[PDB]
PDB file of all heavy atoms in Angstrom:
ATOM      1  N   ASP G  23     -51.528  -0.582  28.488  1.00  0.00           N
ATOM      2  CA  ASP G  23     -52.455  -1.437  27.895  1.00  0.00           C
ATOM      3  C   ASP G  23     -53.214  -2.404  28.868  1.00  0.00           C
ATOM      4  O   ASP G  23     -54.187  -3.065  28.316  1.00  0.00           O
ATOM      5  CB  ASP G  23     -51.659  -2.270  26.948  1.00  0.00           C
ATOM      6  CG  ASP G  23     -51.235  -1.605  25.806  1.00  0.00           C
ATOM      7  OD1 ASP G  23     -50.234  -0.900  25.731  1.00  0.00           O
ATOM      8  OD2 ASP G  23     -51.887  -1.724  24.727  1.00  0.00           O
ATOM      9  N   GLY G  24     -53.113  -2.253  30.214  1.00  0.00           N
ATOM     10  CA  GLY G  24     -53.967  -3.058  31.158  1.00  0.00           C
ATOM     11  C   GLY G  24     -55.466  -2.782  30.989  1.00  0.00           C
ATOM     12  O   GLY G  24     -56.108  -3.748  31.264  1.00  0.00           O
ATOM     13  N   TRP G  25     -55.869  -1.570  30.631  1.00  0.00           N
ATOM     14  CA  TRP G  25     -57.206  -1.215  30.454  1.00  0.00           C
ATOM     15  C   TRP G  25     -57.876  -2.104  29.366  1.00  0.00           C
ATOM     16  O   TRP G  25     -59.174  -2.151  29.243  1.00  0.00           O
ATOM     17  CB  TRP G  25     -57.373   0.214  29.931  1.00  0.00           C
ATOM     18  CG  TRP G  25     -56.779   0.572  28.661  1.00  0.00           C
ATOM     19  CD1 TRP G  25     -55.467   0.811  28.360  1.00  0.00           C
ATOM     20  CD2 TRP G  25     -57.485   0.655  27.449  1.00  0.00           C
ATOM     21  NE1 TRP G  25     -55.312   1.031  27.015  1.00  0.00           N
ATOM     22  CE2 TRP G  25     -56.543   0.978  26.330  1.00  0.00           C
ATOM     23  CE3 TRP G  25     -58.862   0.428  27.097  1.00  0.00           C
ATOM     24  CZ2 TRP G  25     -56.946   1.160  25.109  1.00  0.00           C
ATOM     25  CZ3 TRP G  25     -59.190   0.593  25.749  1.00  0.00           C
ATOM     26  CH2 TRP G  25     -58.338   0.979  24.867  1.00  0.00           C
ATOM     27  N   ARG G  26     -57.153  -2.690  28.487  1.00  0.00           N
ATOM     28  CA  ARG G  26     -57.659  -3.602  27.386  1.00  0.00           C
ATOM     29  C   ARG G  26     -58.113  -4.967  27.895  1.00  0.00           C
ATOM     30  O   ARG G  26     -58.789  -5.693  27.190  1.00  0.00           O
ATOM     31  CB  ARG G  26     -56.607  -3.763  26.341  1.00  0.00           C
ATOM     32  CG  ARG G  26     -56.202  -2.356  25.723  1.00  0.00           C
ATOM     33  CD  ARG G  26     -55.134  -2.470  24.633  1.00  0.00           C
ATOM     34  NE  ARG G  26     -55.506  -3.286  23.600  1.00  0.00           N
ATOM     35  CZ  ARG G  26     -54.785  -3.529  22.531  1.00  0.00           C
ATOM     36  NH1 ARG G  26     -53.506  -3.101  22.369  1.00  0.00           N
ATOM     37  NH2 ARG G  26     -55.234  -4.293  21.547  1.00  0.00           N
ATOM     38  N   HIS G  27     -57.842  -5.366  29.165  1.00  0.00           N
ATOM     39  CA  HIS G  27     -58.371  -6.578  29.692  1.00  0.00           C
ATOM     40  C   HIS G  27     -59.835  -6.596  29.777  1.00  0.00           C
ATOM     41  O   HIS G  27     -60.406  -5.643  30.109  1.00  0.00           O
ATOM     42  CB  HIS G  27     -57.663  -6.725  31.146  1.00  0.00           C
ATOM     43  CG  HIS G  27     -57.929  -8.058  31.750  1.00  0.00           C
ATOM     44  ND1 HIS G  27     -58.990  -8.556  32.405  1.00  0.00           N
ATOM     45  CD2 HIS G  27     -57.113  -9.325  31.599  1.00  0.00           C
ATOM     46  CE1 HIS G  27     -58.870  -9.734  32.745  1.00  0.00           C
ATOM     47  NE2 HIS G  27     -57.754 -10.299  32.161  1.00  0.00           N
ATOM     48  N   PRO G  28     -60.416  -7.660  29.471  1.00  0.00           N
ATOM     49  CA  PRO G  28     -61.923  -7.959  29.553  1.00  0.00           C
ATOM     50  C   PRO G  28     -62.638  -7.422  30.836  1.00  0.00           C
ATOM     51  O   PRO G  28     -63.710  -6.880  30.800  1.00  0.00           O
ATOM     52  CB  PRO G  28     -62.121  -9.463  29.409  1.00  0.00           C
ATOM     53  CG  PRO G  28     -60.920  -9.801  28.612  1.00  0.00           C
ATOM     54  CD  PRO G  28     -59.765  -8.929  28.926  1.00  0.00           C
ATOM     55  N   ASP G  29     -61.972  -7.693  31.917  1.00  0.00           N
ATOM     56  CA  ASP G  29     -62.598  -7.385  33.267  1.00  0.00           C
ATOM     57  C   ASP G  29     -62.417  -5.906  33.581  1.00  0.00           C
ATOM     58  O   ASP G  29     -62.913  -5.466  34.580  1.00  0.00           O
ATOM     59  CB  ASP G  29     -61.975  -8.116  34.382  1.00  0.00           C
ATOM     60  CG  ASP G  29     -62.026  -9.676  34.212  1.00  0.00           C
ATOM     61  OD1 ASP G  29     -62.900 -10.167  33.289  1.00  0.00           O
ATOM     62  OD2 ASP G  29     -61.609 -10.434  34.936  1.00  0.00           O
ATOM     63  N   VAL G  30     -61.605  -5.059  32.924  1.00  0.00           N
ATOM     64  CA  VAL G  30     -61.282  -3.650  33.206  1.00  0.00           C
ATOM     65  C   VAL G  30     -62.364  -2.740  32.767  1.00  0.00           C
ATOM     66  O   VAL G  30     -62.601  -2.870  31.535  1.00  0.00           O
ATOM     67  CB  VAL G  30     -59.830  -3.246  32.888  1.00  0.00           C
ATOM     68  CG1 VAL G  30     -59.638  -1.744  33.111  1.00  0.00           C
ATOM     69  CG2 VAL G  30     -58.759  -3.982  33.637  1.00  0.00           C
ATOM     70  N   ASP G  31     -62.881  -1.909  33.497  1.00  0.00           N
ATOM     71  CA  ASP G  31     -63.749  -0.722  33.007  1.00  0.00           C
ATOM     72  C   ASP G  31     -62.844   0.314  32.627  1.00  0.00           C
ATOM     73  O   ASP G  31     -62.237   0.993  33.486  1.00  0.00           O
ATOM     74  CB  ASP G  31     -64.720  -0.423  34.098  1.00  0.00           C
ATOM     75  CG  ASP G  31     -65.612   0.676  33.798  1.00  0.00           C
ATOM     76  OD1 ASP G  31     -65.527   1.303  32.645  1.00  0.00           O
ATOM     77  OD2 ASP G  31     -66.432   1.062  34.579  1.00  0.00           O
ATOM     78  N   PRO G  32     -62.728   0.683  31.269  1.00  0.00           N
ATOM     79  CA  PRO G  32     -61.850   1.631  30.795  1.00  0.00           C
ATOM     80  C   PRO G  32     -62.321   3.069  31.282  1.00  0.00           C
ATOM     81  O   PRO G  32     -61.547   3.998  31.102  1.00  0.00           O
ATOM     82  CB  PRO G  32     -61.916   1.536  29.298  1.00  0.00           C
ATOM     83  CG  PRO G  32     -63.075   0.817  28.984  1.00  0.00           C
ATOM     84  CD  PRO G  32     -63.566   0.052  30.219  1.00  0.00           C
ATOM     85  N   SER G  33     -63.481   3.356  31.757  1.00  0.00           N
ATOM     86  CA  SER G  33     -63.951   4.525  32.369  1.00  0.00           C
ATOM     87  C   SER G  33     -63.520   4.755  33.834  1.00  0.00           C
ATOM     88  O   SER G  33     -63.919   5.775  34.479  1.00  0.00           O
ATOM     89  CB  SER G  33     -65.435   4.691  32.168  1.00  0.00           C
ATOM     90  OG  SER G  33     -66.171   3.997  33.093  1.00  0.00           O
ATOM     91  N   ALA G  34     -62.846   3.743  34.415  1.00  0.00           N
ATOM     92  CA  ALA G  34     -62.614   3.599  35.840  1.00  0.00           C
ATOM     93  C   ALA G  34     -62.159   4.904  36.465  1.00  0.00           C
ATOM     94  O   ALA G  34     -62.447   5.207  37.590  1.00  0.00           O
ATOM     95  CB  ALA G  34     -61.851   2.452  36.171  1.00  0.00           C
ATOM     96  N   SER G  35     -61.247   5.612  35.778  1.00  0.00           N
ATOM     97  CA  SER G  35     -60.510   6.711  36.352  1.00  0.00           C
ATOM     98  C   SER G  35     -61.364   7.904  36.619  1.00  0.00           C
ATOM     99  O   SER G  35     -60.993   8.812  37.462  1.00  0.00           O
ATOM    100  CB  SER G  35     -59.379   7.215  35.434  1.00  0.00           C
ATOM    101  OG  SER G  35     -58.440   6.230  35.181  1.00  0.00           O
ATOM    102  N   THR G  36     -62.536   8.029  36.023  1.00  0.00           N
ATOM    103  CA  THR G  36     -63.505   9.072  36.353  1.00  0.00           C
ATOM    104  C   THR G  36     -64.866   8.436  36.767  1.00  0.00           C
ATOM    105  O   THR G  36     -65.992   9.147  36.560  1.00  0.00           O
ATOM    106  CB  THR G  36     -63.727  10.096  35.261  1.00  0.00           C
ATOM    107  OG1 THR G  36     -64.117   9.318  33.988  1.00  0.00           O
ATOM    108  CG2 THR G  36     -62.410  10.839  34.845  1.00  0.00           C
ATOM    109  N   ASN G  37     -64.801   7.258  37.207  1.00  0.00           N
ATOM    110  CA  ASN G  37     -66.010   6.503  37.607  1.00  0.00           C
ATOM    111  C   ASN G  37     -66.157   6.477  39.183  1.00  0.00           C
ATOM    112  O   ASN G  37     -65.424   5.893  39.858  1.00  0.00           O
ATOM    113  CB  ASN G  37     -65.966   5.083  37.073  1.00  0.00           C
ATOM    114  CG  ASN G  37     -67.143   4.339  37.326  1.00  0.00           C
ATOM    115  OD1 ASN G  37     -67.808   4.380  38.402  1.00  0.00           O
ATOM    116  ND2 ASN G  37     -67.631   3.594  36.275  1.00  0.00           N
ATOM    117  N   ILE G  38     -67.143   7.279  39.627  1.00  0.00           N
ATOM    118  CA  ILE G  38     -67.284   7.469  41.125  1.00  0.00           C
ATOM    119  C   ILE G  38     -67.642   6.120  41.804  1.00  0.00           C
ATOM    120  O   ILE G  38     -67.124   5.861  42.945  1.00  0.00           O
ATOM    121  CB  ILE G  38     -68.253   8.573  41.452  1.00  0.00           C
ATOM    122  CG1 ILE G  38     -68.350   8.867  42.970  1.00  0.00           C
ATOM    123  CG2 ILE G  38     -69.779   8.276  40.953  1.00  0.00           C
ATOM    124  CD1 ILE G  38     -66.988   9.298  43.510  1.00  0.00           C
ATOM    125  N   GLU G  39     -68.293   5.250  41.147  1.00  0.00           N
ATOM    126  CA  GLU G  39     -68.697   3.912  41.683  1.00  0.00           C
ATOM    127  C   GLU G  39     -67.531   3.088  41.956  1.00  0.00           C
ATOM    128  O   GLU G  39     -67.297   2.389  42.818  1.00  0.00           O
ATOM    129  CB  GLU G  39     -69.740   3.273  40.807  1.00  0.00           C
ATOM    130  CG  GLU G  39     -71.121   3.882  40.852  1.00  0.00           C
ATOM    131  CD  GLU G  39     -71.848   3.613  42.123  1.00  0.00           C
ATOM    132  OE1 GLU G  39     -71.539   2.639  42.921  1.00  0.00           O
ATOM    133  OE2 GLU G  39     -72.847   4.394  42.455  1.00  0.00           O
ATOM    134  N   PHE G  40     -66.637   3.054  40.963  1.00  0.00           N
ATOM    135  CA  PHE G  40     -65.368   2.419  40.963  1.00  0.00           C
ATOM    136  C   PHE G  40     -64.542   2.684  42.150  1.00  0.00           C
ATOM    137  O   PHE G  40     -64.205   1.857  42.983  1.00  0.00           O
ATOM    138  CB  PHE G  40     -64.494   2.555  39.711  1.00  0.00           C
ATOM    139  CG  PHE G  40     -63.159   1.847  39.725  1.00  0.00           C
ATOM    140  CD1 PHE G  40     -63.072   0.521  39.363  1.00  0.00           C
ATOM    141  CD2 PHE G  40     -62.092   2.590  40.224  1.00  0.00           C
ATOM    142  CE1 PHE G  40     -61.841  -0.168  39.477  1.00  0.00           C
ATOM    143  CE2 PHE G  40     -60.811   1.855  40.289  1.00  0.00           C
ATOM    144  CZ  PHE G  40     -60.749   0.553  39.935  1.00  0.00           C
ATOM    145  N   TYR G  41     -64.382   4.058  42.422  1.00  0.00           N
ATOM    146  CA  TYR G  41     -63.692   4.579  43.534  1.00  0.00           C
ATOM    147  C   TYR G  41     -64.307   4.230  44.916  1.00  0.00           C
ATOM    148  O   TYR G  41     -63.684   3.868  45.909  1.00  0.00           O
ATOM    149  CB  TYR G  41     -63.397   6.067  43.414  1.00  0.00           C
ATOM    150  CG  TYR G  41     -62.173   6.410  42.566  1.00  0.00           C
ATOM    151  CD1 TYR G  41     -62.215   6.161  41.206  1.00  0.00           C
ATOM    152  CD2 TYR G  41     -60.898   6.851  43.155  1.00  0.00           C
ATOM    153  CE1 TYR G  41     -61.136   6.339  40.379  1.00  0.00           C
ATOM    154  CE2 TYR G  41     -59.932   7.129  42.281  1.00  0.00           C
ATOM    155  CZ  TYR G  41     -59.914   6.976  41.020  1.00  0.00           C
ATOM    156  OH  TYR G  41     -58.836   7.078  40.102  1.00  0.00           O
ATOM    157  N   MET G  42     -65.673   4.419  45.010  1.00  0.00           N
ATOM    158  CA  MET G  42     -66.346   4.184  46.205  1.00  0.00           C
ATOM    159  C   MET G  42     -66.201   2.673  46.634  1.00  0.00           C
ATOM    160  O   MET G  42     -65.923   2.366  47.709  1.00  0.00           O
ATOM    161  CB  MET G  42     -67.801   4.535  46.037  1.00  0.00           C
ATOM    162  CG  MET G  42     -67.986   5.983  45.823  1.00  0.00           C
ATOM    163  SD  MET G  42     -69.879   6.650  45.985  1.00  0.00           S
ATOM    164  CE  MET G  42     -70.582   5.606  44.657  1.00  0.00           C
ATOM    165  N   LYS G  43     -66.428   1.761  45.597  1.00  0.00           N
ATOM    166  CA  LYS G  43     -66.290   0.252  45.726  1.00  0.00           C
ATOM    167  C   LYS G  43     -64.902  -0.071  46.227  1.00  0.00           C
ATOM    168  O   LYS G  43     -64.768  -0.841  47.226  1.00  0.00           O
ATOM    169  CB  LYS G  43     -66.771  -0.426  44.594  1.00  0.00           C
ATOM    170  CG  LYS G  43     -68.286  -0.463  44.340  1.00  0.00           C
ATOM    171  CD  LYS G  43     -68.598  -1.043  42.904  1.00  0.00           C
ATOM    172  CE  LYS G  43     -70.131  -0.985  42.730  1.00  0.00           C
ATOM    173  NZ  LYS G  43     -70.328  -0.927  41.220  1.00  0.00           N
ATOM    174  N   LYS G  44     -63.911   0.432  45.642  1.00  0.00           N
ATOM    175  CA  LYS G  44     -62.510   0.025  46.101  1.00  0.00           C
ATOM    176  C   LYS G  44     -62.330   0.495  47.472  1.00  0.00           C
ATOM    177  O   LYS G  44     -61.650  -0.150  48.352  1.00  0.00           O
ATOM    178  CB  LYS G  44     -61.508   0.796  45.163  1.00  0.00           C
ATOM    179  CG  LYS G  44     -61.185  -0.131  43.909  1.00  0.00           C
ATOM    180  CD  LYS G  44     -60.119  -1.188  44.092  1.00  0.00           C
ATOM    181  CE  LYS G  44     -59.695  -1.688  42.712  1.00  0.00           C
ATOM    182  NZ  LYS G  44     -58.381  -1.249  42.228  1.00  0.00           N
ATOM    183  N   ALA G  45     -62.728   1.845  47.822  1.00  0.00           N
ATOM    184  CA  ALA G  45     -62.481   2.403  49.104  1.00  0.00           C
ATOM    185  C   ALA G  45     -63.144   1.586  50.238  1.00  0.00           C
ATOM    186  O   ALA G  45     -62.679   1.418  51.316  1.00  0.00           O
ATOM    187  CB  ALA G  45     -62.905   3.889  49.180  1.00  0.00           C
ATOM    188  N   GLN G  46     -64.422   1.219  49.852  1.00  0.00           N
ATOM    189  CA  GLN G  46     -65.181   0.298  50.776  1.00  0.00           C
ATOM    190  C   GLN G  46     -64.638  -1.216  50.980  1.00  0.00           C
ATOM    191  O   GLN G  46     -64.748  -1.766  52.046  1.00  0.00           O
ATOM    192  CB  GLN G  46     -66.745   0.346  50.436  1.00  0.00           C
ATOM    193  CG  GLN G  46     -67.204   1.824  50.487  1.00  0.00           C
ATOM    194  CD  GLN G  46     -68.608   1.964  49.856  1.00  0.00           C
ATOM    195  OE1 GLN G  46     -69.076   1.109  49.107  1.00  0.00           O
ATOM    196  NE2 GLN G  46     -69.344   3.001  50.245  1.00  0.00           N
ATOM    197  N   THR G  47     -64.113  -1.631  49.965  1.00  0.00           N
ATOM    198  CA  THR G  47     -63.311  -2.888  50.066  1.00  0.00           C
ATOM    199  C   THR G  47     -62.104  -2.781  50.847  1.00  0.00           C
ATOM    200  O   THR G  47     -61.978  -3.631  51.820  1.00  0.00           O
ATOM    201  CB  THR G  47     -62.877  -3.355  48.628  1.00  0.00           C
ATOM    202  OG1 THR G  47     -64.030  -3.594  47.934  1.00  0.00           O
ATOM    203  CG2 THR G  47     -62.167  -4.735  48.624  1.00  0.00           C
ATOM    204  N   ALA G  48     -61.343  -1.683  50.699  1.00  0.00           N
ATOM    205  CA  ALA G  48     -60.213  -1.522  51.572  1.00  0.00           C
ATOM    206  C   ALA G  48     -60.618  -1.272  53.130  1.00  0.00           C
ATOM    207  O   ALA G  48     -59.929  -1.705  54.007  1.00  0.00           O
ATOM    208  CB  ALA G  48     -59.464  -0.171  51.089  1.00  0.00           C
ATOM    209  N   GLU G  49     -61.730  -0.668  53.247  1.00  0.00           N
ATOM    210  CA  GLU G  49     -62.229  -0.414  54.629  1.00  0.00           C
ATOM    211  C   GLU G  49     -62.690  -1.764  55.306  1.00  0.00           C
ATOM    212  O   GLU G  49     -62.480  -2.009  56.376  1.00  0.00           O
ATOM    213  CB  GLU G  49     -63.363   0.544  54.694  1.00  0.00           C
ATOM    214  CG  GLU G  49     -63.827   0.878  56.054  1.00  0.00           C
ATOM    215  CD  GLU G  49     -64.629   2.156  56.113  1.00  0.00           C
ATOM    216  OE1 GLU G  49     -65.455   2.465  55.299  1.00  0.00           O
ATOM    217  OE2 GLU G  49     -64.423   3.002  57.094  1.00  0.00           O
ATOM    218  N   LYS G  50     -63.294  -2.650  54.439  1.00  0.00           N
ATOM    219  CA  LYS G  50     -63.645  -4.115  54.827  1.00  0.00           C
ATOM    220  C   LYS G  50     -62.338  -4.685  55.331  1.00  0.00           C
ATOM    221  O   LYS G  50     -62.473  -5.564  56.332  1.00  0.00           O
ATOM    222  CB  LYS G  50     -64.302  -4.816  53.699  1.00  0.00           C
ATOM    223  CG  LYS G  50     -64.804  -6.192  54.130  1.00  0.00           C
ATOM    224  CD  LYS G  50     -65.542  -6.829  52.813  1.00  0.00           C
ATOM    225  CE  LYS G  50     -66.030  -8.261  53.253  1.00  0.00           C
ATOM    226  NZ  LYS G  50     -66.626  -8.963  52.027  1.00  0.00           N
ATOM    227  N   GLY G  51     -61.280  -4.433  54.672  1.00  0.00           N
ATOM    228  CA  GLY G  51     -59.989  -5.030  55.194  1.00  0.00           C
ATOM    229  C   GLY G  51     -59.266  -4.302  56.310  1.00  0.00           C
ATOM    230  O   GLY G  51     -58.162  -4.632  56.609  1.00  0.00           O
ATOM    231  N   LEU G  52     -59.956  -3.317  56.830  1.00  0.00           N
ATOM    232  CA  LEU G  52     -59.417  -2.518  57.913  1.00  0.00           C
ATOM    233  C   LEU G  52     -58.223  -1.644  57.540  1.00  0.00           C
ATOM    234  O   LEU G  52     -57.436  -1.261  58.320  1.00  0.00           O
ATOM    235  CB  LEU G  52     -59.124  -3.332  59.196  1.00  0.00           C
ATOM    236  CG  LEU G  52     -60.241  -4.404  59.549  1.00  0.00           C
ATOM    237  CD1 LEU G  52     -59.685  -5.245  60.814  1.00  0.00           C
ATOM    238  CD2 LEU G  52     -61.538  -3.905  59.801  1.00  0.00           C
ATOM    239  N   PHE G  53     -58.065  -1.524  56.330  1.00  0.00           N
ATOM    240  CA  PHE G  53     -56.857  -0.727  55.830  1.00  0.00           C
ATOM    241  C   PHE G  53     -56.795   0.640  56.518  1.00  0.00           C
ATOM    242  O   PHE G  53     -57.889   1.264  56.778  1.00  0.00           O
ATOM    243  CB  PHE G  53     -56.926  -0.470  54.252  1.00  0.00           C
ATOM    244  CG  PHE G  53     -56.379  -1.611  53.418  1.00  0.00           C
ATOM    245  CD1 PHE G  53     -56.557  -2.881  53.786  1.00  0.00           C
ATOM    246  CD2 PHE G  53     -55.735  -1.277  52.239  1.00  0.00           C
ATOM    247  CE1 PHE G  53     -56.165  -3.973  52.983  1.00  0.00           C
ATOM    248  CE2 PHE G  53     -55.278  -2.401  51.451  1.00  0.00           C
ATOM    249  CZ  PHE G  53     -55.486  -3.732  51.837  1.00  0.00           C
ATOM    250  N   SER G  54     -55.586   1.043  56.846  1.00  0.00           N
ATOM    251  CA  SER G  54     -55.500   2.365  57.541  1.00  0.00           C
ATOM    252  C   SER G  54     -55.774   3.555  56.653  1.00  0.00           C
ATOM    253  O   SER G  54     -56.235   4.665  57.197  1.00  0.00           O
ATOM    254  CB  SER G  54     -54.000   2.488  58.102  1.00  0.00           C
ATOM    255  OG  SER G  54     -53.897   1.618  59.124  1.00  0.00           O
ATOM    256  N   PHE G  55     -55.627   3.454  55.414  1.00  0.00           N
ATOM    257  CA  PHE G  55     -55.863   4.595  54.502  1.00  0.00           C
ATOM    258  C   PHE G  55     -56.102   4.160  52.988  1.00  0.00           C
ATOM    259  O   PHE G  55     -55.565   3.004  52.605  1.00  0.00           O
ATOM    260  CB  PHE G  55     -54.780   5.660  54.631  1.00  0.00           C
ATOM    261  CG  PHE G  55     -53.389   5.095  54.191  1.00  0.00           C
ATOM    262  CD1 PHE G  55     -52.893   5.450  53.058  1.00  0.00           C
ATOM    263  CD2 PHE G  55     -52.623   4.586  55.225  1.00  0.00           C
ATOM    264  CE1 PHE G  55     -51.666   5.012  52.644  1.00  0.00           C
ATOM    265  CE2 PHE G  55     -51.376   4.122  54.821  1.00  0.00           C
ATOM    266  CZ  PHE G  55     -50.823   4.373  53.557  1.00  0.00           C
ATOM    267  N   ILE G  56     -56.707   5.014  52.350  1.00  0.00           N
ATOM    268  CA  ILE G  56     -56.635   4.971  50.913  1.00  0.00           C
ATOM    269  C   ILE G  56     -55.698   6.124  50.310  1.00  0.00           C
ATOM    270  O   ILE G  56     -55.572   7.196  51.056  1.00  0.00           O
ATOM    271  CB  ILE G  56     -57.992   5.083  50.129  1.00  0.00           C
ATOM    272  CG1 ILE G  56     -58.700   6.500  50.474  1.00  0.00           C
ATOM    273  CG2 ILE G  56     -58.868   3.918  50.581  1.00  0.00           C
ATOM    274  CD1 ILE G  56     -59.839   6.860  49.495  1.00  0.00           C
ATOM    275  N   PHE G  57     -55.092   5.963  49.276  1.00  0.00           N
ATOM    276  CA  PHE G  57     -54.147   6.881  48.635  1.00  0.00           C
ATOM    277  C   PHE G  57     -54.330   7.204  47.239  1.00  0.00           C
ATOM    278  O   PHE G  57     -54.594   6.371  46.407  1.00  0.00           O
ATOM    279  CB  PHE G  57     -52.737   6.275  48.765  1.00  0.00           C
ATOM    280  CG  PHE G  57     -51.684   7.122  48.032  1.00  0.00           C
ATOM    281  CD1 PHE G  57     -51.483   8.446  48.290  1.00  0.00           C
ATOM    282  CD2 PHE G  57     -50.929   6.564  47.004  1.00  0.00           C
ATOM    283  CE1 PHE G  57     -50.457   9.101  47.538  1.00  0.00           C
ATOM    284  CE2 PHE G  57     -50.016   7.209  46.348  1.00  0.00           C
ATOM    285  CZ  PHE G  57     -49.691   8.594  46.596  1.00  0.00           C
ATOM    286  N   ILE G  58     -54.411   8.501  46.953  1.00  0.00           N
ATOM    287  CA  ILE G  58     -54.725   8.913  45.541  1.00  0.00           C
ATOM    288  C   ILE G  58     -53.463   9.705  45.168  1.00  0.00           C
ATOM    289  O   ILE G  58     -53.139  10.680  45.575  1.00  0.00           O
ATOM    290  CB  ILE G  58     -55.947   9.907  45.541  1.00  0.00           C
ATOM    291  CG1 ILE G  58     -57.147   9.370  46.206  1.00  0.00           C
ATOM    292  CG2 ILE G  58     -56.239  10.409  44.035  1.00  0.00           C
ATOM    293  CD1 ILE G  58     -57.660   8.049  45.327  1.00  0.00           C
ATOM    294  N   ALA G  59     -52.889   9.119  44.174  1.00  0.00           N
ATOM    295  CA  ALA G  59     -51.559   9.716  43.460  1.00  0.00           C
ATOM    296  C   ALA G  59     -52.052  10.838  42.580  1.00  0.00           C
ATOM    297  O   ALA G  59     -53.294  11.027  42.383  1.00  0.00           O
ATOM    298  CB  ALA G  59     -50.825   8.743  42.636  1.00  0.00           C
ATOM    299  N   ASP G  60     -51.109  11.585  42.060  1.00  0.00           N
ATOM    300  CA  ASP G  60     -51.605  12.728  41.239  1.00  0.00           C
ATOM    301  C   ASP G  60     -50.462  13.059  40.198  1.00  0.00           C
ATOM    302  O   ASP G  60     -49.343  12.774  40.456  1.00  0.00           O
ATOM    303  CB  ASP G  60     -51.972  13.920  42.104  1.00  0.00           C
ATOM    304  CG  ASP G  60     -52.778  14.893  41.338  1.00  0.00           C
ATOM    305  OD1 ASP G  60     -53.592  14.356  40.444  1.00  0.00           O
ATOM    306  OD2 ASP G  60     -52.738  16.217  41.441  1.00  0.00           O
ATOM    307  N   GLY G  61     -50.894  13.743  39.107  1.00  0.00           N
ATOM    308  CA  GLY G  61     -50.033  14.352  38.136  1.00  0.00           C
ATOM    309  C   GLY G  61     -50.616  15.677  37.625  1.00  0.00           C
ATOM    310  O   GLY G  61     -51.816  15.922  37.742  1.00  0.00           O
ATOM    311  N   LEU G  62     -49.724  16.530  37.055  1.00  0.00           N
ATOM    312  CA  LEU G  62     -50.125  17.823  36.750  1.00  0.00           C
ATOM    313  C   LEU G  62     -49.752  18.198  35.253  1.00  0.00           C
ATOM    314  O   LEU G  62     -49.787  19.442  34.893  1.00  0.00           O
ATOM    315  CB  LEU G  62     -49.452  18.816  37.639  1.00  0.00           C
ATOM    316  CG  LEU G  62     -49.820  18.743  39.079  1.00  0.00           C
ATOM    317  CD1 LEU G  62     -48.963  19.651  39.978  1.00  0.00           C
ATOM    318  CD2 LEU G  62     -51.297  19.054  39.282  1.00  0.00           C
TER     319      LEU G  62
END
């Protein structure tokens, strides 16, 4: 139900801008990596 929060974009999981922005935020913090979990 977290997606129901006002600030959450419920399209985020297939939103390329969302992913690019998070990855670039992480890079701003010098994070060693980004990680993408998966399910089948």
Side-chain angles (χ1 to χ4, degrees):
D23 289 78
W25 68 275
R26 301 177 62 184
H27 194 271
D29 299 351
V30 174
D31 179 354
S33 78
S35 299
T36 53
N37 186 316
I38 187 58
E39 290 288 340
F40 179 84
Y41 277 69
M42 294 189 305
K43 285 171 185 156
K44 280 270 191 105
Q46 295 170 344
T47 296
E49 184 160 43
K50 190 178 180 183
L52 318 180
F53 278 38
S54 286
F55 61 96
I56 63 160
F57 169 58
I58 306 292
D60 198 34
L62 299 171

